[model samples]
Target chain A: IDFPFAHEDVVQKTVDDVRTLSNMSAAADQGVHDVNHSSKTLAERYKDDITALAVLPPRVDEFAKSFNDILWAGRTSATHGVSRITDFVDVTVVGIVEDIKTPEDRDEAVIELNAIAGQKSKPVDGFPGATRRLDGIWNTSSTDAANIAKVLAIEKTVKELTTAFSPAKAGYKKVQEALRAYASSITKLAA
Target chain B: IDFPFAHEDVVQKTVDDVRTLSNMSAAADQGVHDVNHSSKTLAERYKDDITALAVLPPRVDEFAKSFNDILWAGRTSATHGVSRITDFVDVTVVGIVEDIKTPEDRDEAVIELNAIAGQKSKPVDGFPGATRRLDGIWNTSSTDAANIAKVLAIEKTVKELTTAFSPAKAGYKKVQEALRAYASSITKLAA
Candidate 1:
């Protein structure tokens, strides 16, 4: 039972936040393609250059596979994260911002946003979990050739995906914060 | 005056480090293509979906362009970072490991590796600086639509490049740290 009309600025802010989330989703979809394509190119190039070098370690191929395995997992994570955010934004989020966006609308939008915010299938909650899991698996300090090979590739790939997650997290954080403030204003204005 | 043979392990570590740097460089080259392709796809998609919808701000085109501008700069930065790491690794790093790889050959390799480690044109020094500058330029919290458009794109792009630089920095750091250890070993064995 919140009157959005009294807080048009809040309504506007929600619209902006929702829009930014969509923008991020769009970028992330492309990010999947970027990471995948780049990884393939790297794999091919590394195999060609290092495979025949007699002086290089006998485990060069194993090391190269380790790099790809982590990167491949990253690309998979990117695809899943991108899909989750895009589906949420395209359907539920758009419904909130575009359909029921009137200032007079009460807690309808707030409730919907909050619901999606914590949902397991959505970006706000899911992306963070997905990234943490992948980061844990790939990041090892063992001095094995495969482990050494992964050092740079994993740090770069996971960190990039983490940054790619930045938008949805930031956008959702804004909405939740705004919703709390809007509630505060309701109490004060009534008083 | 550093005998590499006595510390062949360190010499071997340098070879591994240099090779990993090369692997990262290979990935970075493809990253330029990946990011560029992804950004272009996003620009087209965002414009088509949001531009025709009048509910979106009057600045729809402007916002799309803002996203593109930051992404474009990122592509440029990615290309530059990839190029710098590749050249340094290919030329100087390769020279150290291949041409003078005998651990018995003293500080010649050490001197050369140390020289590239500090060179501004090289990955160890240059990449960190480039990423920092670009990160400063694009990471603004202004509530303007253009700024909002840039939020996710810039964070993802700059962070990716920063991760992209991880290998060279990590590899060089390992070499420099090992150099100090070698110096200590030089004194201890003599003592």
Candidate 2:
């Protein structure tokens, strides 16, 4: 028994040594240690990425200016042609990601939030004009806590970059793929 | 002027050929192609991914069994839950490799999603009272059309799976990730 226990400890230590070695190897390895790293450097990375690829013109801000000038909401349809309820959620998600530090931390924060969300069930955004959009879709029905949680997660990722970043790469990649398929199907069927 | 254009084309094609022959190529070459391939396949490929993934053993009958599972009403408080009122939009986001058919599509899909999630989101597994360990958070407002669209996209994927014999891969991935993140985050913050 003593030998077995001692032997296990040795193996565990060896694994730890390999891990430490791999971690010190480079930025990618170190990147995993701090999820906030991406948040801090992403803007610069984004700019450089665009510049390197020659995708941006000299006046990138000018190209992006049209967005600032366009704002309009018109009567489209009675059956609630459109709803910004989801947009509210997106805004909230952006705020949350900004404050969060690590992937694991972000994960934990959401779980705690969902619990509170269940209790209050407030509608900050995403179901605007309760009479139109909210009334049409989304009511408290069956295991909403989980459903709400799912929504929050989706919203947060969508808010961030729409593409999976470095930290939660695997998970992000998986989810993005799912969305692509769904979008295509919707476009085709809805079209 | 015509020769310049023709020469440019030849140069570009030669560059493409050389890049392929080399051990690596420009990130743009790989990245652009990857994104498009992934997005296109999402609508066309994954429509049938489920037959291989969700229908076999633990996943199939379980999803089938819940065909009539009634979604509960949104809760005001943990103790004071509301009655099921509106028809809830079942959302499912399936994510895949980064690739959008168009810049507008990518931007809208990505940034919009992240914006809505708020603080309550994470990769999740179905919890108590639900059959398949799922992911996702919920909302009750009428403003969250994006979230609803995301959700509808999910449910639509499932609905399509019934008769469509397939679902888009990206759609399915986004739906699952959206659900998972929502669930995980809620569990962390709210639960």
Candidate 3:
């Protein structure tokens, strides 16, 4: 009964998250390499242009496409039959493929995702007789409270990290746009 | 021996990443939470209001101040005492204390940084027989480069979590101001 993210928006959110992480990672890699070796002479630099930019690979893009398809279900009259969920699924698959290089790593991630997705950022239960301390709550409560809590957590984290990297995240927007576009395409395809 | 964030441009990169993730996460969490519980009108409506206006926390702003301090060290002259690398360390320490929850987590992070600073990216028994190799060049590279790589990795992870929460990364100039302010503050603080 408890959906993690909305069915309509989950796909898009997944796609966006993957895209941003990938793009930022790539850019920061290059930027750091360039800055570190800035002292290299022209001859040394010519051989290896530290500024050689990287693009999101075809596989990454394709994965986005696939997730878009899955989200929307089949194809819509619009996207010429691409799925809305295609982007989310595709990106998730691609990220898993790239980051979880080893079989062990992949299996572990799957386990973690399944186990922790629902209760992430919240505390886990302790042993018996370890009475949980009194927790305060507002007088009124609503179901959306959890989502609000989740986003607030996200906001606090991002703010801290943002202080660490700026331009890299700026470029990440392009990746986000692609996911958004792909999401639109999927919705169209689904229709 | 290890440097952080590849010539200080990395701080900005981190900031941007933070902004993007924060916005997306905040909006997505709100939208999805609202969509799922629409059937429960009164509860849903109230939850909507709470989630809709959640504010960015003070810690985020505090982190931003320290982030810019690193930039100051990277860009400013020797005469600007506070803008030096020493100031960056102090800023980092303060930020971590303010943001991180557990001493154990902080200890682990420090240990990771120590290892990463020591060029521990490559494996001990590198492949020689097979063309399949390990991170050879990166391992042999300068400490600064290794540090930058680590920073990028950290930035990517944090930004992803944050963007999943908030939407302020689009304000590019505000980000720049943060960097500049912290940079100058370091100089002034040191003086």
Instruction: Identify the leading candidate in terms of lDDT.
Output: 1
CAPRI-wise, candidate 2 is incorrect
Interface RMSD of 3: 20.0
DockQ of 2: 0.01
Give the alpha carbon lDDT tens digit for every residue of B138-188 in model 2.
322122324323443333444543323122222333333433333333233
Cα lDDT, model 1, residue B126: 26
Model 2, position B101: C-alpha lDDT score: 44
Q: Write the per-residue lDDT of candidate 1 for residues A57-148, one digit (tens) a residue.
A: 22323333343343334345434444444434444334443344344542454444444444442122223333443232112101111221
Name the TM-score of chain A in model 3. 0.24
TM-scores, chain A, per candidate: 0.29, 0.21, 0.24
| Sort by TM-score, top down from the best | 1, 3, 2
Which of the two, 1 or 2, has more TM-score?
1
Q: What is the C-alpha RMSD of each candidate to the true structure, in Å?
A: 31.3, 36.9, 32.0
Candidate 3 local lDDT, B1-191, one digit each (tens): 22223234644564554343233223322322332222133223223212211111222233224433432333242123222222223333234422445667556445544544454332212111110111221222234323433543244554542343122223223334443443444354422
Scored by lDDT, model 1 comes in at 0.36
The RMSD (Cα, Å) of candidate 3 is 32.0
Q: What DockQ results do all the predictions give, each relative to the true complex?
A: 0.01, 0.01, 0.01
Scored against the true structure, residue A3 in model 1 reaches a CA lDDT of 24
| lDDT of every model, 2 decimals | 0.36, 0.28, 0.30
